[PDB]
Design a protein around this ligand. Structure first.
Ligand SMILES: CCC(=O)SCCNC(=O)CCNC(=O)[C@H](O)C(C)(C)COP(=O)(O)OP(=O)(O)OC[C@H]1O[C@@H](n2cnc3c(N)ncnc32)[C@H](O)[C@@H]1OP(=O)(O)O
Ligand SMILES: Nc1ncnc2c1ncn2[C@@H]1O[C@H](COP(=O)(O)OP(=O)(O)OP(=O)(O)O)[C@@H](O)[C@H]1O
Ligand SMILES: [Mg+2]
Lengths: 261, 673, 247
């Protein structure tokens, strides 16, 4: 029996669906799109080329080797595309799969995309919706973060880097957006804090919720971390395309010139 | 050390410190497997590593770790311990402990219970000594109970009166009076303090011998009745009635008195049926009359020094006696072979009350073991922490020689070549004592520290020649550092032109005077000119070693550069004492004349807590004046205690940092006036 | 000063329980030549320590965490204090030595509103951009993203060591237990099995994130050897006018 083809198609349909229809319904009820919808809106129609669709995580601890804990893609969709004819590299984090927590494979995919971007000389756009670091993955997860960090520092001043926070972001998932040139957020749905409010109450003992501890208003008015805040996902992506039209593709290229009237 | 002789196979040491190391050493030499008990704090101590295996006893405090008989006995039972050595202190004289040992099967390396209880109580010890027809101090038999009885005793025995609380020891519960009113007030104070200190509340009037010499006779007894007196030792040098300097061959005492005291000690030991090792202390007046004072029923702390003259290992003899073998030596065999001197190195400041127990962690520790005729009994290794729960011991330094002068010279050299960095030690006090004219001549007593230093220890008073040598060495060290600072590696892009300065004109500010020094270099020899005097200083000038040896006009001196700063301050140890100097260039001094003094009174009226935590200790009270930089309160946070202080002399308006208060960071604690 | 001098006094300077603190300046003094240390900003942001010293006669820059002040947690002031010192040491070819004991970043609302993310990224960038030799020694805790910041091997670090008291983990064992085994709700042996395999430097060592688990007494000698091997280090980076540090 030629089960390889049906296995390939089942893996494709599982990756395209993230981690389940119920979780996608929960994501939509929160007012948030999925990673693939975000990429479809951001890029030109019929220009997305995806990389590492079938990559799976190698963790085999705490019952993470069971088939119910094997999601292809591993909570990140990476690839390349074009905006108004100009090449760009993109990664979007899927909150459906393990809350978007970064494991080894996640870091490998992001670093692979960033390495191609630094080799060719094209910008990187990253949509962050990670719930922190995958605890089951262990120190490996930490290592992955550092790898990404290094590449960011290596790509500073060589290619433009843009970050858009479209969901919660905590723990060490905050340094990479800070190392990029520009950071944008989505109002009422995006968060950015090193430490969660519960630990804040536990340690320094005051009542604060997520909204005024890491919300877009807080990080766009009184912290200076983010650069702009947009109404929702569609508006954010349209404004991101408009902004990307301005920048050059590499430090070697001169300032872009359009047609003037 | 006969391996054929089959003694016990396993021995448990029930003590901590250098004594545990001593017992482990002699057991490893003699072949016995050794198991060592340790608290949680001392889990990395020297004796734990030295022992074959170790068993933890429990919490840090001594009352809970080494004084817990149940833990000791379970440790013995688990490890199949055959014999036990208590050392000195802790359960050395514990009656119920030995009762439990005799109950199960356990042999005790030490005297029997009868001797322990006979010599434990001072009154019954004196009574037995009277029954032992040995010379005793003049006193009234019985326990004084009322002031009138005490003053009457003072009447018949004479105005010099000393009240001693029965039992206990360690220079406690003893008051000296000279008048009947002094007799009664000392009596009432002693009665009040006996319950707090000892609890026996039994008090004894005794006659105070004037300037006694505290001689001690080491005695070795076996189970077959053979008692031997192994020479003598002198421990006149005391502070707080505690021994510091200890001489094995007595110089004041002579052969006839030695024989008489040995015979008396042996007779009393036979009377007590003492079948182990111990010591008997005697007080000798100016007229060579010796009076009994206490018999130790344990291994004496200053045993090693006599081991240098007799040539015997006391602990090995104790083990053999505990086995049951008769003594292998006779009264004739023992001889006085040379001279031996011991100094007890404590971790205490000799500049305050002749030693105030300090704490700290040793960043550097090097013993002078390479010097000839030096023995170091220590339980200290680099990194060891001096705690508050234990006797602030550092080590015991012993020198042996042909005669007294050689031993004293070797002690001086060893003390000069001894490196302790991390706490405050009393090395300066020891070295200054051993070079005193009175000590060298031999006119010493129990008041040596008091009469020699009425104002207290002040350090070595250096003479004009010593001052010149110190200034020359300091200037030479300064110039050597400056010259070393110019030895960069070759750059080949911007070549370095080394300055060709020939003479250095420096101003050195020792104590308060200012001296003009002119120094020149001709390689390894510095020609120094201090206030007219001309000196030559030579050395290898190794600026990194802790100990630096320099020859000044032939005289060899070992010095340590404890501290050095770019501003000119230099703290250097010379002849035991740490001197602070300030060396500047001549132009630097001339310009510094313009700089105005900064008065350091500060205000610090509103003092704030460092970090949020509970205040364990409060050193101030409202209405009490403080000083500049005076300790205010000790606060613990994350069980880390910080002792935060004040900044200026001011009366405390109110203490908000009371004990137990969980004051937060930057909170008002004490207000100063 | 011999480059192979032993430092046994460091063998027990780290308390075995995790609640007491210790002075890392003591370790720095023990390691360096002649115990001479020129500290920079010694009274400001005292939870981090930076300074100049010498190893085998060669100038070295030293950065470390101070567990006495604020338990070693990183904050804005310490991050900006360390970042520029690291940048200056890199710019003028001065090797860097790091002593790592950090439980994480200091929490609170004031830190979040002050922009702790930007200032932490400053230090992360400063360590990642270094092209001079870098030696790192972990004395105890290295928890979370702080472990990434404090000169990790993953940031193109050269040589990393760990003392037998080191502990590299995403977080403390406790919170990791309540977060991983939340469903099991029975931790009496779960905590024991977690701390027996993760509350030690083995997870970091077996993945090669540290080159060796050295003894504290052999620190200085080891470092000296590295500084004689890494003196001729040269790396190449992509061309740029300048990089956009998160200033
Ligand atoms: C001393 C050093 C340190 O402090 S280490 C800090 C690391 N500790 C963390 O918890 C990571 C930080 N993450 C978070 O705080 C929260 O996840 C935040 C970011 C607030 C997300 O908010 P929230 O929308 O309520 O998440 P959620 O409960 O709806 O999502 C549940 C799914 O996400 C997953 N998830 C979350 N965090 C982790 C994690 N650290 N490791 C592994 N998985 C994580 C949950 O497992 C859960 O999985 P699933 O997707 O439902 O299958
Ligand atoms: N009768 C006395 N005449 C003169 N001096 C005395 C007399 N009794 C005690 N002293 C002085 O007091 C010191 C302490 O003596 P003693 O050995 O009794 O003290 P202790 O604290 O009981 O000792 P230990 O720790 O050995 O039990 C002696 O060294 C001596 O200087
Ligand atoms: Mg006595």
């Amino acid at each position: 029996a030629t089960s390889v083809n049906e296995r390939i198609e089942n893996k494709r349909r599982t990756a395209l669906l993230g981690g389940g229809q119920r979780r996608i319904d929960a994501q939509h009820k929160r007012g948030k799109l999925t990673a693939r919808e975000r990429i479809s809106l951001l890029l030109d129609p019929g220009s997305f080329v995806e990389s590492d669709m079938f990559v799976e995580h190698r963790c085999a601890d705490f019952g993470m080797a069971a088939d119910k804990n094997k999601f292809p893609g591993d909570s990140v969709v990476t690839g390349r595309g074009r905006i108004n004819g100009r090449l760009v590299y993109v990664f979007s984090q899927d909150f459906t799969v393990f809350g978007g927590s970064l494991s080894g494979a996640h870091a490998q995919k992001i670093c692979k995309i960033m390495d191609q971007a630094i080799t060719v000389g094209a910008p990187v756009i990253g949509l962050n919706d990670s719930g922190g670091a995958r605890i089951q993955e262990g120190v490996e997860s930490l290592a992955g973060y550092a790898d990404i960090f290094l590449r960011n520092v290596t790509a500073s001043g060589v290619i433009p880097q843009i970050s858009l926070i479209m969901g919660p972001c905590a723990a060490a998932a905050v340094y990479s957006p800070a190392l990029t040139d520009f950071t944008f957020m989505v109002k009422d749905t995006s968060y950015l804090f090193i430490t969660g409010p519960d630990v804040v109450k536990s340690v320094t003992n005051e009542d604060v919720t997520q909204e005024e501890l890491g919300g877009a208003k807080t990080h766009t008015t009184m912290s200076g971390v983010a650069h702009r805040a947009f109404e929702n996902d569609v508006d954010a992506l349209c404004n991101l395309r408009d902004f990307f039209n301005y920048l050059p593709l590499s430090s070697q290229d001169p300032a872009p010139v359009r047609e003037c009237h | 050390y006969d391996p054929n002789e089959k003694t016990f196979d396993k021995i448990l040491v029930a003590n901590r410190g250098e004594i545990a190391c001593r017992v482990i050493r002699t057991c490893k030499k003699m072949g016995i497997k050794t198991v060592a008990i340790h608290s949680d704090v001392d889990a990395s101590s020297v004796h734990v590593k030295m022992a074959d295996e170790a068993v933890c006893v429990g919490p840090a405090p001594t009352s809970k770790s080494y004084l817990n008989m149940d833990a000791i006995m379970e440790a013995i039972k688990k490890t199949r311990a055959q014999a036990v050595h208590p050392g000195y202190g802790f359960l050395s004289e514990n009656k119920e402990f030995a009762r439990c040992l005799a109950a199960e099967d356990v042999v005790f390396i030490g005297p029997d219970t009868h001797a322990i209880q006979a010599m434990g109580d001072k009154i019954e010890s004196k009574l037995l000594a009277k029954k032992a027809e040995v010379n005793t101090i003049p006193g009234f038999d019985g326990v004084v109970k009322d002031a009138e009885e005490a003053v009457r005793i003072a009447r018949e025995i004479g105005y010099p009166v000393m009240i001693k609380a029965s039992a206990g020891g360690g220079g406690k519960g003893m008051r000296i009076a000279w008048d009947d009113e002094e007799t009664r007030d000392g009596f009432r104070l002693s009665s009040q303090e006996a319950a707090s200190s000892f609890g026996d509340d039994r008090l004894l009037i005794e006659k105070f011998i004037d300037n006694p010499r505290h001689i001690e006779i080491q005695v070795l007894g076996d189970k077959h009745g053979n008692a031997l007196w192994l020479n003598e030792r002198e421990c006149s040098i005391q502070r707080r009635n505690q021994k510091v300097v200890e001489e094995a061959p007595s110089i004041f005492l002579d052969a006839e008195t030695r024989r008489a005291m040995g015979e008396q000690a042996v007779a009393l030991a036979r009377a007590v049926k003492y079948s182990s090792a111990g010591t008997v202390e005697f007080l000798v007046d100016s007229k060579k009359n010796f009076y009994f004072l206490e018999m130790n029923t344990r291994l004496q702390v200053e045993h090693p020094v006599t081991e240098c003259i007799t040539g015997l290992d006391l602990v090995q003899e104790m083990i053999r006696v505990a086995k049951g073998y008769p003594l292998r030596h006779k009264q004739a065999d023992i001889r006085i072979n040379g001279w031996a001197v011991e100094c007890r190195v404590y971790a205490e400041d000799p500049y305050k009350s002749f030693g105030l127990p300090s704490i700290g962690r040793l960043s550097q520790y090097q013993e002078p073991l390479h010097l000839p005729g030096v023995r170091v009994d220590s339980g200290i290794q680099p990194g060891s922490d001096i705690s508050i729960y234990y006797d602030p011991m550092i080590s015991k330094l012993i020198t042996y020689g042909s005669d007294r002068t050689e031993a004293l010279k070797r002690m001086a050299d060893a003390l000069d070549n001894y490196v302790i960095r991390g706490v405050t030690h009393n090395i300066a006090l020891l070295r200054e004592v051993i070079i005193n004219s009175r000590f060298v001549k031999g006119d010493i007593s129990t008041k040596f520290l008091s009469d020699v230093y009425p104002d207290g220890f002040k350090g070595h008073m250096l003479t004009k020649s010593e001052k010149n040598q110190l200034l020359a060495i300091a200037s030479s060290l300064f110039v050597a550092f400056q010259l070393r600072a110019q030895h960069f590696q070759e750059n080949s892009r911007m070549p370095v032109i080394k300055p060709d300065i020939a003479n250095w004109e420096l101003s050195v500010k020792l104590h308060d005077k200012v001296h003009t020094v002119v120094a020149s270099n001709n390689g390894s020899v510095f020609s120094v000119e201090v206030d007219g005097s001309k000196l030559n200083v030579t050395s290898t000038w190794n600026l990194a070693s802790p100990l630096l040896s320099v020859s000044v006009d032939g005289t060899q001196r070992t010095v340590q550069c404890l501290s050095r700063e770019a501003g000119g301050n230099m703290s250097i140890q010379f002849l035991g004492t740490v001197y602070k100097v300030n060396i500047l260039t001549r132009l630097a001094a001339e310009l510094n004349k313009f700089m105005l003094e900064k008065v350091t009174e500060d205000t610090s009226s509103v003092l704030r807590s460092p970090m949020p935590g509970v205040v364990v200790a409060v050193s101030v009270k409202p209405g009490d004046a403080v000083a500049e930089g005076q300790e205010i309160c000790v606060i613990e946070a994350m069980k880390m205690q910080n002792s935060m202080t004040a900044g200026k002399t001011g009366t405390v308006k109110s203490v908000h940092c009371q004990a137990g208060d969980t004051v937060g960071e930057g909170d008002l604690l004490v207000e100063l006036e | 000063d011999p480059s192979d001098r032993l430092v046994p006094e460091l063998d027990t300077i780290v308390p075995l329980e995790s609640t007491k603190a210790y002075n890392m300046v003591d370790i720095i003094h023990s390691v360096v030549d002649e115990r001479e240390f020129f500290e920079i900003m010694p009274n400001y942001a005292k939870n981090i320590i930076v300074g100049f010293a010498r190893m085998n006669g060669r100038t070295v820059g030293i950065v470390g965490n101070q567990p006495k002040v604020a338990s070693g947690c990183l904050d804005i002031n310490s991050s900006v204090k360390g970042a520029r010192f690291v940048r200056f040491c890199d710019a003028f070819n001065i090797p860097l030595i790091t002593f790592v004991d950090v439980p994480g970043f200091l929490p609170g609302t004031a830190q979040e509103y002050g922009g702790i993310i930007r200032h932490g990224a400053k230090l992360l960038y400063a360590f990642a951009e270094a092209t001079v030799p870098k030696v790192t020694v972990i004395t105890r805790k290295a928890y979370g993203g702080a472990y990434d910041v404090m000169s990790s091997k993953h940031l193109c670090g050269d040589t990393n060591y760990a003392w037998p008291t080191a502990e590299i983990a995403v977080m403390g064992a406790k919170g990791a237990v309540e977060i991983i085994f939340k469903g099991h709700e029975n931790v009496e042996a779960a905590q024991a099995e977690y701390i027996e395999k993760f509350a030690n430097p083995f997870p970091a060592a077996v993945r090669g994130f540290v080159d060796d688990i050295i003894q504290p007494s052999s620190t200085r000698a080891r470092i000296c050897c590295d500084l004689d091997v890494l003196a001729s280090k040269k790396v190449q980076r992509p061309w740029r006018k300048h990089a956009n540090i998160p200033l």
